[PDB]
Design an enzyme around this catalytic site. Structure first.
Site, mmCIF file in Angstrom:
data_model
loop_
_atom_site.group_PDB
_atom_site.id
_atom_site.type_symbol
_atom_site.label_atom_id
_atom_site.label_comp_id
_atom_site.label_asym_id
_atom_site.label_seq_id
_atom_site.Cartn_x
_atom_site.Cartn_y
_atom_site.Cartn_z
ATOM 1 C CG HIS A 124 -0.378 0.455 2.522
ATOM 2 N ND1 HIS A 124 -0.111 -0.452 3.492
ATOM 3 C CD2 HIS A 124 -0.276 1.691 3.098
ATOM 4 C CE1 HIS A 124 0.277 0.242 4.598
ATOM 5 N NE2 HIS A 124 0.138 1.559 4.373
ATOM 6 C CB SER A 166 2.749 1.807 6.350
ATOM 7 O OG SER A 166 1.527 2.132 7.007
ATOM 8 N N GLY A 167 5.229 -0.272 6.126
ATOM 9 C CA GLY A 167 6.365 -0.685 5.371
ATOM 10 C C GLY A 167 7.608 -0.999 6.170
ATOM 11 C CG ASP A 181 0.184 -3.895 2.990
ATOM 12 O OD1 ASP A 181 0.564 -3.445 1.885
ATOM 13 O OD2 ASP A 181 -0.289 -3.131 3.867
ATOM 14 N N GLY A 230 2.773 6.574 8.286
ATOM 15 C CA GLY A 230 4.192 6.827 8.162
ATOM 16 C C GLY A 230 5.054 5.698 8.700
#
Ligand SMILES: [Ca+2]
Length: 240
Positions: free
Chosen positions: A45, A188-189, A93, A186
């Site tokens: 995402h 995320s990942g 994801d 922020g």
């Protein structure tokens, strides 16, 4: 990271910042983990959109020069083939980024250690989340890398109705849920580092939190379970 503390500069050297071009400036959007000298793992995402991306390795303060940064372009984005932008709860994801060049490893810049395939942690395993994401719900990004202690919540408890229900799958890790500490937009990942046999390995990729808010009691932060993807990772990396 909500309820975090600043990390030491050299604690988490696999952390990267994923940034996009915003006018003539670059802003932080997501985290990621450096997994090869020219491969970054992050969330699908984060890279859903048509933006120009860059990776920063060796970053500690987003707004000031550290004396340690390396700034690198993104050459190819490979999203997982099953990822569906309209359903984050379906999972997958996960995205791999091939960088324009190889980075130089040093004490600020190391590769992240990945779990062995199939690995599941016990309930309440010791993990830290890191990131520069929002430090409050609807708040602002951090300037310096924050860490939070965020113990795991196993699947049987996390998929229970009081927690996430059917929204969480066995391809996800849940961590935190105390109402005080969490990941937030922020983060995320980015990595979930968990201590296993004396070494911190990256067991999660920060995926989603509650629409009610980032630090919600019994809504642990939810991670893509890295050990569910080890064959996909390596198959991508061999072939590109
Ligand atoms: Ca900096």
């Amino acid at each position: 990271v909500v309820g975090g503390t600043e990390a030491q500069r050299n604690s988490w050297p696999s952390q990267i910042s994923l940034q996009y071009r915003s006018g003539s400036s670059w802003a932080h959007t997501c985290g990621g983990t450096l997994i090869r000298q020219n491969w970054v793992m992050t969330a699908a995402h984060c890279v859903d959109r048509e933006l120009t991306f860059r990776v920063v390795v060796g970053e500690h303060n987003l707004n000031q020069n550290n004396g340690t940064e390396q700034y690198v372009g993104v050459q190819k984005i490979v999203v997982h083939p099953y990822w569906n932008t309209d359903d984050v709860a379906a999972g997958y994801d996960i995205a791999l980024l091939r960088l324009a060049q190889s980075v130089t490893l040093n004490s600020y810049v190391q590769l992240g250690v990945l779990p062995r395939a199939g690995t599941i942690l016990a309930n309440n395993s010791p993990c830290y989340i890191t990131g520069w994401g929002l430090t409050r719900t609807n708040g602002q990004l951090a300037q310096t890398l924050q860490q939070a202690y965020l113990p795991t919540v196993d699947y049987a408890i996390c998929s229970s109705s009081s927690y996430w229900g059917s929204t969480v799958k066995n391809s996800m890790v849940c961590a935190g849920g105390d109402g005080v500490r969490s990941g937030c937009q922020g983060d995320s990942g980015g990595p979930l580092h968990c201590l296993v046999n004396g070494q911190y390995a990256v067991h999660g990729v920060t995926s989603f939190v509650s629409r009610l808010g980032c630090n919600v009691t019994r809504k642990p932060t939810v991670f893509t379970r890295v050990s569910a993807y080890i064959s996909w990772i390596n198959n991508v990396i061999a072939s590109n």
